[PDB]
Design a protein around this ligand. Structure first.
Ligand SMILES: Cc1cc2nc3c(=O)[nH]c(=O)nc-3n(C[C@H](O)[C@H](O)[C@H](O)COP(=O)(O)OP(=O)(O)OC[C@H]3O[C@@H](n4cnc5c(N)ncnc54)[C@H](O)[C@@H]3O)c2cc1C
Ligand SMILES: NC(=O)c1ccc[n+]([C@@H]2O[C@H](COP(=O)([O-])OP(=O)(O)OC[C@H]3O[C@@H](n4cnc5c(N)ncnc54)[C@H](OP(=O)(O)O)[C@@H]3O)[C@@H](O)[C@H]2O)c1
Ligand SMILES: Cc1cc2nc3c(=O)[nH]c(=O)nc-3n(C[C@H](O)[C@H](O)[C@H](O)COP(=O)(O)O)c2cc1C
Length: 616
């Protein structure tokens, strides 16, 4: 990327004394950064949030040139305790630099967690490194946990952070409070249709005029060739889709991920407009009131409210506390204005109400507008407050050795009864489920997508043994692994053992790729096809039980055969239980104490022989 000029100079030229950097992948850290940046005004200060990737952090050395200057880092962790893609350069710089940061004042809030090994790795590193470099910490490191409730961890940290800042710099709670807007509304009663965004992510008309290379800013509209129901029963809906990436020049390997940009439910969009009495077809733009910022709009503009609510805004996840806080002013019934205002509390009934009535109940914006009927905010402000609609990732279920021009997806459609009382539908899966191949040329079901390279890969040597554990939709990446493994064999190569440990409720309910797997097994592509049917008997039978059963042979492949272990699917419980079972296997056949088995297994991970492709 081409770097922006010195952030320190921008701050000087714009009267800013605090800058907040975000290492964000799915926007969580980015949003916290903006919240902190906006907070500054309430304390006699002025800040800006910034993407570290667009700057050279070596300029931190010049920050002391600004009086009462301070830098805050909101850093989330990804991969294997890595830094977010956008924080890679900063991370590389921190280890390599020897620059002296004497005079620099900092604070760090990490978006870390517990269902992962190095929980909050990045956050801890930045906070530690800046100090080593000579900078002085102005407030304790924050350790947020997305497994419980990050929002609340942030609220807690934030509540103590500002007072600490005011006391150190000797500033007053000046601003106190008062509704402030980041963007101004400009309605376009004309506008040449050719310059109105209709859902594209980057360059205007980029969805209609496709031009490579394609990525997150320029997605490729892949035609949906196939979309079929995978499960045999009716309990749920599991689907297999095939996206045509021919002529896109996109490359991929088994184990990578495919991201898609979905469209919200039209009915839901319609109702929001209706309940607010807003005309959704109004063409408009929301322009930053700060003419100096590079963030000219909250989303592609000009555009209609309908398009924004459909392709650019998140209207289904529970609104964050600051959003409800800003909306409170539009609730005409006192008790309702009060509940909304108190959602941002660090303790008490207001906090409990938020955790239960909003988060736990999974109340999206429309639900709140319906249940607190006096809340009728203007459409333009709400659009400024809502977070951006994020792309959804899927473990590519095919091998490029076999399907170089097609990317496959295996997904379960999300649809559940929320405690809010309504049925919530998953944005991307509901949208993907409705995509229909059409028929030859009559209608073209297109899916905006791009590929994100992962580190989940089959061994370089075809002879290395492979142990795959992926129950449920965790089978997704392994279909690619297996197609490729079978391919290698077909190509005359010597392939080591390939074992699949799969699981589903019942063979006649949701045994995904039943036919394909049976075929691969029959042809020898799969050395063993171990399937745990969890509900075909009174007790549970899970993949870990099969692993325990085969402990002796697996240990042989692991300790003597240099086998590679892969775990995909549920990251919350399955992955951990599977990990624990491997601990026990190693502990028995080592032999060695549990503590040592853990180390042994954690080493396999570091040496690239124990990989994960899990999610929640
Ligand atoms: C690297 C990676 C790979 C992935 N690979 C796959 C894959 O191969 N296949 C696949 O199916 N998915 C996969 N996912 C999950 C995928 O990205 C989507 O999250 C999933 O398909 C649902 O998206 P959605 O937009 O339909 O749902 P959304 O509208 O985004 O809603 C999902 C949210 O709803 C909530 N939720 C769901 N069920 C309930 C319930 N019963 N009660 C309360 N809350 C609930 C949760 O908070 C969840 O976060 C992957 C994720 C990552 C990060
Ligand atoms: N937030 C929520 O409330 C919520 C609720 C449901 C699902 N989800 C999400 O939706 C996804 C469901 O994916 P899926 O359809 O592919 O999986 P799935 O069908 O639910 O499960 C696959 C197989 O794994 C078994 N299993 C359950 N717990 C296990 C454990 N601890 N260890 C080993 N095996 C276990 C299941 O048996 P049994 O089911 O009989 O135990 C089943 O046979 C998950 O990634 C999850 O994050 C979220
Ligand atoms: C694919 C994936 C990998 C993750 N890996 C880690 C990890 O190694 N350590 C950790 O503490 N959290 C991990 N998390 C959780 C994030 O750190 C946490 O959800 C954070 O709030 C995300 O912030 P963001 O939206 O700003 O990127 C992971 C989340 C996803 C989706």
């Amino acid at each position: 990327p081409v770097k922006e000029s010195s952030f320190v100079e921008k701050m000087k030229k714009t009267g800013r004394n605090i800058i907040v950097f975000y290492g964000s992948q799915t926007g969580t850290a980015e949003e916290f950064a903006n919240r902190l940046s906006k907070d500054a005004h309430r304390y006699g200060m002025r800040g800006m949030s910034a993407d570290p990737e667009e700057y050279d952090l070596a300029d931190l050395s010049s920050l002391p040139e600004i009086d009462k200057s301070l830098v805050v880092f909101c850093m989330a962790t990804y991969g294997e305790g890595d830094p977010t893609d956008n924080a890679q350069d900063f991370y590389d710089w921190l280890q390599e630099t020897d620059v002296d940061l004497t005079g620099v004042k900092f604070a760090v809030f990490g978006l870390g967690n517990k269902t992962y090994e190095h929980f909050n790795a990045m956050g801890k590193y930045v906070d530690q490194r800046l100090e080593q470099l000579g900078a002085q910490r102005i407030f304790e490191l924050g350790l947020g946990d997305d497994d419980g409730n990050l929002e609340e961890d942030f609220i807690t940290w934030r509540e103590q952070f500002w007072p600490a800042v005011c006391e150190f710099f000797g500033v007053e709670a000046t601003g106190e409070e008062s509704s402030i807007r980041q963007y101004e509304l400009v309605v376009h009663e004309d506008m040449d249709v050719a310059k109105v965004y209709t859902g594209e992510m980057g360059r205007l008309k980029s969805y209609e005029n496709q031009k490579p290379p394609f990525d997150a800013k320029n997605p490729f509209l892949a035609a949906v060739t196939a979309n079929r129901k995978l499960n045999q029963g009716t309990e749920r809906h599991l689907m297999h889709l095939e996206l045509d990436i021919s002529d896109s020049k996109i490359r991929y390997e088994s184990g990578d991920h495919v991201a898609v940009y979905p469209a919200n439910d039209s009915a839901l969009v319609n109702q929001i407009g209706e309940i607010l009495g807003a005309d959704l077809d109004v063409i408009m733009s929301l322009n930053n009131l700060d003419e100096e910022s590079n963030k000219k709009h909250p989303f592609p503009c000009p555009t209609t409210y309908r398009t924004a609510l459909t392709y650019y805004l998140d209207i289904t996840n529970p609104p964050r506390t600051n959003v409800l806080y800003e909306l409170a002013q539009y609730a005409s019934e006192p008790s309702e204005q009060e509940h909304l205002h108190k959602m941002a509390s660090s303790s008490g009934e207001g906090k409990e109400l938020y955790l239960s009535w909003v988060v736990e109940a999974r109340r999206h914006i429309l639900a709140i507008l319906q249940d607190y009927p006096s809340l009728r905010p203007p459409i333009d402000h709400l659009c400024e407050l809502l977070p951006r609609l994020q792309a959804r990732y899927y473990a590519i279920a095919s091998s490029s050795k076999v399907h170089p021009n097609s990317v496959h997806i295996c997904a379960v459609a999300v649809e559940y009864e929320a405690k809010s009382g309504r049925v919530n539908k998953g944005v991307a899966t509901s949208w993907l489920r409705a995509k229909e191949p059409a028929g030859e040329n009559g209608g073209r079901a297109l899916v905006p997508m791009f590929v994100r390279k992962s580190q989940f890969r089959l061994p370089f040597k075809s002879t290395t043994p492979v142990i795959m554990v992926g129950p449920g939709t965790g089978i997704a990446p392994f279909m690619g692994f297996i197609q490729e493994r079978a391919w290698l064999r077909e190509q005359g190569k010597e392939v080591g053992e390939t074992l699949l440990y799969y699981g589903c409720r019942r063979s006649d309910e949701d045994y995904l790729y039943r036919e394909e797997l049976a075929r691969f097994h029959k042809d020898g592509a799969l050395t063993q096809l171990n399937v745990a049917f969890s509900r075909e008997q009174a007790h549970k039978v899970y993949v870990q039980h099969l692993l325990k059963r085969d402990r002796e042979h697996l240990w042989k492949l692991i300790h003597e055969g240099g086998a590679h272990i892969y775990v995909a699917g549920d990251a919350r419980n399955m992955a951990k239980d599977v990990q624990n079972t491997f601990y026990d296997i190693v502990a028995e056949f080592g032999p060695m104490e549990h503590t040592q088995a853990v180390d042994y297994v954690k080493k396999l991970m570091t040496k690239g022989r124990y990989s994960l492709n899990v999610w929640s």
